[PDB]
Scaffold this active site. Structure first.
Site, PDB file in Angstrom:
ATOM      1  N   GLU A 169       0.928  -1.011  -0.129  1.00 19.41           N
ATOM      2  CA  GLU A 169       0.041  -0.145  -0.031  1.00 19.41           C
ATOM      3  C   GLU A 169       0.837   1.170  -0.054  1.00 19.41           C
ATOM      4  O   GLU A 169       1.035   1.739   1.220  1.00 19.41           O
ATOM      5  CB  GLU A 169      -1.020  -0.152   1.119  1.00 19.41           C
ATOM      6  CG  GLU A 169      -2.072  -1.062   1.051  1.00 19.41           C
ATOM      7  CD  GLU A 169      -3.169  -0.956   2.273  1.00 19.41           C
ATOM      8  OE1 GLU A 169      -2.854  -0.600   3.051  1.00 19.41           O
ATOM      9  OE2 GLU A 169      -4.204  -1.656   1.935  1.00 19.41           O
ATOM     10  N   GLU A 302      -6.652  -8.066  -0.620  1.00 23.95           N
ATOM     11  CA  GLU A 302      -7.216  -8.064   0.804  1.00 23.95           C
ATOM     12  C   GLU A 302      -8.739  -7.611   0.706  1.00 23.95           C
ATOM     13  O   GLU A 302      -8.968  -6.592   0.106  1.00 23.95           O
ATOM     14  CB  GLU A 302      -6.317  -7.063   1.782  1.00 23.95           C
ATOM     15  CG  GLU A 302      -4.917  -7.331   1.979  1.00 23.95           C
ATOM     16  CD  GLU A 302      -4.334  -6.236   2.865  1.00 23.95           C
ATOM     17  OE1 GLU A 302      -5.008  -5.435   3.316  1.00 23.95           O
ATOM     18  OE2 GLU A 302      -2.942  -5.951   2.838  1.00 23.95           O
TER      19      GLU A 302
END
Ligand code: NA
Length: 373
Positions: A169, A302
């Site tokens: 991320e 995710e």
């Protein structure tokens, strides 16, 4: 009598599109090899693996996941506390990562390994070293490429069940979620945004080039590049929400062995199931528009709901609505050939050592949403 020694056991590598379909439903071994504490220095692998309260991982956990219907495990890894001044990963840490990968592929499940909290939002003593900032990219390109050369070399001889993911991320220097420069004054800074997508695309290129440059199976291994922040483009509340999708450049030379990854934690609290299904359809539509419809497969690496980390989760507060969300999310992803990897839960903490599901109902719900007739 020694002629079988000349045998060349050629390893086939399926397309990334087929890999992502064949992953089925996946799970993340979260808060484990990705755990980190910038205020500490480690002297054993156990200290790193257990610093966020998960136990030392054992192979039986993955036998259990496989038997429950899971087809793939994402194994997030954070590397910076395992690298010396030159960027070299110590042998003990690489050996441990390899053990966990072995536990997964022993069950004939796919395994994704990545570079995890080397990215992310700065907080207190933690400052991520990989940032979506072109000056950061120019500064750190050499070290980042060296890290991926090392990982790629260690895992070079594995077959196509092992995939690599470039970075988790990655955020701009303002730690903007949603889209690059969202955290700037006025919710946008074009200089920062343009820098951020150049950096994302540079790190993506550097990753592919470093991995493929090690040769052998790594020329055909299925590799995964993430969008800015692993943002997924959903929503219409700001005109820049699609920029993480539309401003991603697939590295030159990639076609049949590349996938794109986003994360998704949709809000279900306060919504009807009809509205939730529409939100999921909008999320999937954007992934189809920018990637799947162009022959670039997508992994939702995710997911859970927006309250996954809240003091009151949706599993506790609105379990049936969460399960209806699960059913539809997995189904809509499956229809597009998008693989999903649930974030933690399921078997957590000491439950993993048993092994046992502490959320048996949710684990079964996810598996049946994909496999059940
Ligand atoms: Na150490």
């Amino acid at each position: 009598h020694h002629h079988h020694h000349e045998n060349l056991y050629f390893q086939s590598f399926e397309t990334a599109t087929n890999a992502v379909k064949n992953m089925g439903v996946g799970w993340n071994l979260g808060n484990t090899l990705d755990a980190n504490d910038a205020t500490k220095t480690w002297t054993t692998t156990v200290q790193h693996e257990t610093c966020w309260g998960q136990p030392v991982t054992k192979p039986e956990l993955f036998k259990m996941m496989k038997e429950a219907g899971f087809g793939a495990i994402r194994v997030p890894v954070t590397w910076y506390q395992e690298m010396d001044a030159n960027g070299k990963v110590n042998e003990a840490w690489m050996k441990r990562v390899k053990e966990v990968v072995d536990y997964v592929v022993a069950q004939d499940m796919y395994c994704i390994i990545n570079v995890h909290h080397d990215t992310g939002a700065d907080k207190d003593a933690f400052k991520s070293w990989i940032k979506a900032d072109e000056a950061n990219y120019n500064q750190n390109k050499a070290k980042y490429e060296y890290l991926w050369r090392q990982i790629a070399e260690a895992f070079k001889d594995y077959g196509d069940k092992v995939l690599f993911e470039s970075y988790n991320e990655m955020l701009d220097k303002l730690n903007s979620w949603c889209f690059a420069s969202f955290a700037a004054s006025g919710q946008y800074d074009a200089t920062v945004a343009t820098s951020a997508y150049n950096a994302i695309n540079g790190y993506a290129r550097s990753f592919v080039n470093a991995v493929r440059g090690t040769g052998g199976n790594n020329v055909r291994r299925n590799l995964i590049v993430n969008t800015y922040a692993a943002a997924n483009g959903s929503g219409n509340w700001n005109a820049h929400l699609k920029d993480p999708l539309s401003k991603l450049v697939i590295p030159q030379g990639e076609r049949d062995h590349i996938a794109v990854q986003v994360h998704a934690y949709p809000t279900i609290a306060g919504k009807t199931i009809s509205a939730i299904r529409t939100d999921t359809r909008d999320l999937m539509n954007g992934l189809n528009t920018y990637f799947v419809s162009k022959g670039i497969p997508v992994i939702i690496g995710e997911w859970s709901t927006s309250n996954v980390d809240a003091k009151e989760t949706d599993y506790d507060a609105r379990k049936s609505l969460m399960f209806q969300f699960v059913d539809d999310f997995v189904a809509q992803a499956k229809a597009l050939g998008i693989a999903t990897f649930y974030w933690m839960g399921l078997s957590d903490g000491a439950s993993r050592t048993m092994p046992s599901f502490n959320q048996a109902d949710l684990a079964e719900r996810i598996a049946k949403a994909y496999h059940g007739v």
